[PDB]
Design a protein around this nucleic acid. Structure first.
Length: 291
DNA sequence: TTAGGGTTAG
């Protein structure tokens, strides 16, 4: 007899293990913590409008919620509820499992999860649709490089073209999205044999590519990325450079992925089954012809 | 256990 009960977020009590549905208001993509497992922080909200911050840990990266953007809808099974500093918080419990869905009205309802076996009923369809209806109104779009501003944080959907070690504390990712930034990208000094990727393709693209420097904890992740894959770089930071190291006046746009995980700073590889990747590929094809 | 959301400051 399989009957799952979902608890409204405003009815959660400490010292319990529950099942919940919610819309993602904020999230830190999976990152190897200072401990044993990978960690993902997800703040969800539902019709009760009560927010719940969930601390999710797992030895396997894919076991954590497959969330690609705020607004996504999640279903959490075996979520433990506890109190931390008078604040109720959700944390992973043994057997924790999640399903993630697109959060926009009319979008396909395709559960994303690493679980081989999982319960999925008509009730789940209704639950998801109900959250999309609520979200369309109680709460809430992809920025192209040609539209970035001088100094801001943003999430960049792009394709990785090249990788290059720099100084251990930082690592270079050369990416593109098919559009050109308003000011030329800065260019990190690279070495001779260090940059991996199609050098001639990169050279022909000229300023269609940008240099992103990632720091600290982001380095080993960047080091593992496969050239040619599609990525979403969260909370990338743009900074215009009007004065160079030799004290000369100029203009270049710097791109930094600063150390730490605050505000979701991180990188998640986007599979080709991702609808944003389909659109990106077309922009890349178009840019490739006129260049 | 990790982390406990809230931007490096290169």
């Amino acid at each position: 007899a399989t009957n799952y009960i979902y608890t409204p977020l405003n009815q959660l009590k400490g010292g319990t293990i529950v099942n919940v549905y919610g819309v993602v208001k904020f999230f830190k993509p999976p990152y190897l913590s200072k401990g044993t497992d990978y960690c993902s922080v997800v703040t969800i909200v539902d019709q009760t409008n009560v927010k719940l911050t969930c601390l999710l840990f797992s030895g396997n990266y894919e076991a954590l919620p497959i969330i690609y953007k705020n607004g996504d809808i999640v279903r959490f099974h075996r979520l433990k509820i506890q109190v931390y500093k008078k604040e109720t918080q959700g944390i992973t419990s043994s057997g924790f499992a999640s399903l993630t869905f697109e959060g926009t009205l009319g979008a396909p309802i395709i559960p994303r999860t690493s679980s081989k076996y999982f319960n999925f009923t008509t009730e789940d369809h209704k639950m998801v649709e109900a959250l999309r209806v609520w979200a369309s109104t109680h709460m809430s779009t992809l920025l192209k490089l040609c539209d970035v501003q001088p100094m801001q944080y943003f999430d960049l959907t792009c394709q990785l073209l090249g990788k290059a070690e720099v100084d251990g504390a930082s690592f270079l990712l050369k990416v593109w999205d098919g559009t050109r930034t308003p000011f030329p990208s800065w260019r990190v000094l690279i070495q001779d044999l260090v940059l991996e990727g199609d050098l001639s393709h990169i050279h022909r693209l000229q300023n269609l590519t940008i240099d992103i420097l990632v720091y600290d904890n982001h380095v080993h992740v960047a080091r593992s990325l496969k050239v040619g894959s599609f990525l979403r770089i969260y909370s990338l930071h743009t900074k215009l450079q009007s004065m160079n190291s030799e004290n000369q006046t100029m203009l270049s746009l710097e791109f930094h992925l600063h150390g730490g995980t605050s505000y979701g700073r991180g990188i998640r590889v986007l599979p080709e089954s991702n609808s944003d990747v389909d659109q990106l590929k077309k922009d890349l094809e178009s840019a490739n012809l006129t260049a």
